[PDB]
């Protein structure tokens, strides 16, 4: 990791044992559940591509998903190469060179160049660029490892609205979808896939009713 | 979070693994229980909107409450905009741009922006403004996910007074009701819904008796 | 709390995740057991009233004890308020005000006021004042939830004197009773409530024996 | 280990209890599963050769595997002495001695030579050379201690492709096979050792298919 | 406790949670066992009298000993007052008041006074003095609470010399005897009080043999 | 212990809780195992004799070993005094006193003296010296509490070769014998003490076969 102290004093730190353990245990316990993404992202704030590779490589099992993640990363490295030409210019001997895809993915750069890119002026955020590429592949993994389709999420006849809504927003959370489309699934599907009895109730509230009002309206139906 | 050092030197740091796990296990273990709000608020001291959002996004499950909270937050951000019109013409180069409700909520603002208002003299403490909106949305949730009103809490045949007075001020603690109404519930219901045996003993003290007189009188029944 | 660093800089620090966990486990493992009150005093070393209410409020359940505690704090506050003369008109900017009972209890004051009082020499130690009120209320509660009278503790037919002494000064520690009454209990009851055999041993030493002499005599019975 | 602090400041410190313990417990619990080698690299960031011997000598249990690794360490050591002969006379003015194989392996050399080599400019990275020699012998242990070869990974009749693919990308992970060769093993063996139903669907995709296209095709199978 | 930084700055810091918690755990796991007195002393590095009292009060149960310990501390406090009485007239303007036993016992002395004595020119280490007084009483607990004497350990017909010697030196640790008396007990009781089969062997090695030599001798009897 | 900071500022530090807990746990799990001995050095890197006395004295039980160790140290101590006699006539004015053997074992030397010798230039390493005596004595203990002869380690009629090479080198590790003789045990005894079926397997490879070759050859017999 690299920890910035007062005055922007940037110092690399080797990775902590209790980070290593927390992150590995999270993936053993909860698998590819959506909270893994914010947890991953948090626990790798200021990480180098080597520290990020550590976190993935210290995981055993789930090797079908990690093989997909490698490929996804290899695709984002071919796309960084496509977008940023490979030509070495009249750059100074002591100044940082220009990162490649494989520099970003942590394979052709050294730790000192990765610390260098991050700390240097101008900086290149090779650690966070790589995080976006991992997180994308994780979006593919979460989406792939979902057991449920969001359209089949429906209120039962004897199902409290509130337990259905937990089901609706779990299965929705685990979709990759535009926000606009997710807005549409809330405003169309929630009232639409309800039970007749509760369906009536949410309609009487009209279109400016809140989920709070909606849960409290269906408290005893 | 942002650690205030000596000479008033404020340096940001990312949120700890053991804060993340203590907050995560709290929600798993204790659900929407009243002490969860001071516990959340306490583990979130010195938090930015990004750190508060981290803590909420690392909560896996309970998504009907997180959606109810999203709508609540949006209502407090939008309400902030209601109070404050858009600031016309050019922004001054010595001055920070004044936050909109969506900058406070952490979404049309960067992390660096959040740190910018909060640290820049005279500080705008957007973390502690937004935090109060979160603690607002949580109270609504704590109060909703409560199964019992005070009328529904009574002492059974052989139940010790002590466990009942605990049940009573736990359910009162979690109610929506005002202090004049929560006084009325205390002075009426508490002795009224005691069992025959304990009710007889509390009647023999008089009505002017204290909770201390009430606890040491009715203990062995 | 407020951590004093070098050359007497007292600077506030948030209550640590492990402070919180420690108080949660202490209350979990040992409830309303005597030595828990020292754990609290220790965990509240250099604490503010916000940090005292945070610790009390972070307690799961036990609202009969906490409602009793509120009643005691509110009584201690009304008594402080009673004794201190009322301020004539507003407080001029150079006048650091003198706290009312509710200022001490953290309900009418700001954190900056609580810090202000403590650091502005001759210090008004509002944390340490409020802690005595809380500790005082914890002793009443503790004494009141204490199961067994000191009078009723007695030796088994061939029970070891040492184990009987452990029970006697364990129960004695939870007794309301005066130091002078407890000195009588030492001189009268300790031999008195022993069993026929050990009683005889103990009687033969006369009253000049210390507890080591009582212990070494009853080393074999 | 040796901690690089602000501005090339290298400072010696002891190997951490909870480091040491983390390594003993990974080996106690999990032996020589593929994830153990990345864990060992994760836990030894900035370790000297001495610190690296500390970690091998603190293993109890499994001394045939540890023996295999010493022999490997002597092989890797002898090869370093073959490639670079002894350097005659007394050491060059203000220059560090070129280490032997036994110096990299931490036996003929002293900890102060090891700290000089690592911290000097140009640095001699003795810690990372020996660490490769250890990682090579841990791979011989991993591979030997494995019961299944990648030729032997095959799908059940009613088995999910995904769980099988997890056994395959785990087994592929422990292969000493080169990357051009691992690529043949992916495009050939995965479908070939598939069940007849999932095999048919995957053959229909053509030879252009990704792992994702293969997993989403055999989702219903 | 009081933490010394560079330039001889001694600044008090509040008692650590995990120090507190570890102490508590020691008394529960090992009771008042011999090895506890060096662990306690170890855990009470830089302790004030108030931190020493905090450790004693943070224990519950085992109160016959806690009573022995109280009385012993009072005796020693009474001894310091006898050895060091009050000197004529009021206190110096710039210096501290000379300590009483009750000030060393931390009961009549404020924390500030206690900081005062350790930091003062000339300093009285009232912590380290009080701790020795505590340790005298702890040794009285160890010696009283040992179940058996060094005289009472002799070797059975199927007992291994090794286990016999384990028992001998265990029991010795807890006795009152001096090193020249303890020396006599090694050279006299151990072989004397051994079983016939090991005794012939040990006599044969002759009285200049070590315990390692005696232990190897008696290894297959 | 003594922590060497940047630019070589050596300041003594209090004996860390997880130093104390780590050594306690280590002894509880691994007793007289050979692995205790590197762990002992690693956990004592940077120690004083006071601190080494703390770890040894905080060991409960094992009092046969503590007497054997004690004896080994007094022997090493007696000898250090024989070889290093104190200088003729009057003392150098500024200098520190001569460490005697008991000083080095921390018996007769205070904390300050031990800190002087270690930090003084040229340093007298009382800590590292005491550790070799402690390690010498620990190696005797380990070896004593090991019982099996290496001649007695043989393969069962259908025992896995690995479980026998593990037993063989576990017992070999605790043998006293020179390295060339341990090389002789490797070449003679290993293949010799194997069962008819595995013996046959190894005999077919020819006698030049490496342990990697012996282990893959007997992978399944």
Author numbering:
A (entry chain R), B (entry chain S), C (entry chain Q), D (entry chain P), E (entry chain O), F (entry chain N): 1 to 221
What did the publication describing this PDB structure actually write?
Gag is one of the principal polyproteins of HIV-1 and its constituent domains are (from N-terminus to C-terminus): matrix (MA), capsid (CA), spacer peptide 1 (SP1), nucleocapsid (NC), spacer peptide 2 (SP2), and p6. In the mature virion, the CA forms the genome protecting protein shell, which contains ~216 CA hexamers and 12 pentamers in a fullerene type arrangement. The CA protein monomer is divided into an N-terminal domain (NTD) and a C-terminal domain (CTD), connected by a flexible linker. A highly conserved sequence in the CA protein, the major homology region (MHR), plays a critical role in assembly, maturation, and infectivity.
Purified CA(A92E)–SP1 protein assembles well into helical tubes under conditions identical to those used previously for CA(A92E), adopting a wide range of helical symmetries. The CA(A92E) mutant was used since less bundling of tubes is present, resulting in higher resolution cryo-EM data than for the wild-type (WT) CA, in addition to attenuating the CypA-binding loop dynamics. Among these, the tubes of the most abundant helical symmetry (−8, 14) were selected for three-dimensional (3D) reconstruction, using the iterative real-space helical reconstruction method (see Zhang et al. for information regarding helical symmetry). The cryo-EM structure of the CA(A92E)–SP1 tubular assembly was determined from 33 tubes at 8 Å resolution, with a gold standard fourier shell correlation (FSC) of 0.143. All α-helices in the resulting density map were well-resolved, which permitted accurate MDFF fitting of three neighboring CA hexamers and analysis of the interactions at the dimer and trimer interfaces. In both CA(A92E) and CA(A92E)–SP1 tubular assemblies, the atomic models of the CA–NTDs superimpose well (Cα RMSD = 1.2 Å), and the CA–CTD dimer interfaces are also similar in both structures (Cα RMSD = 1.6 Å). In contrast, the trimer interface in the CA(A92E)–SP1 assembly (between gold, magenta, and blue monomers) is less compact than in the CA(A92E) assembly (green) similar to the trimer interface observed in the CA–SP1–NC structure. In addition, the linker between the NTD and CTD is conformationally less variable in CA(A92E)–SP1 than in CA(A92E) (Cα RMSD = 0.8 and 2.1 Å for CA monomers in a CA(A92E)–SP1 hexamer and a CA(A92E) hexamer, respectively). This suggests that SP1 limits the conformational space available for positioning the CTD. For the SP1 peptide itself, no detectable electron density was present, indicating that SP1 is likely conformationally or dynamically disordered and does not form a stable, unique helical structure in the tubes.
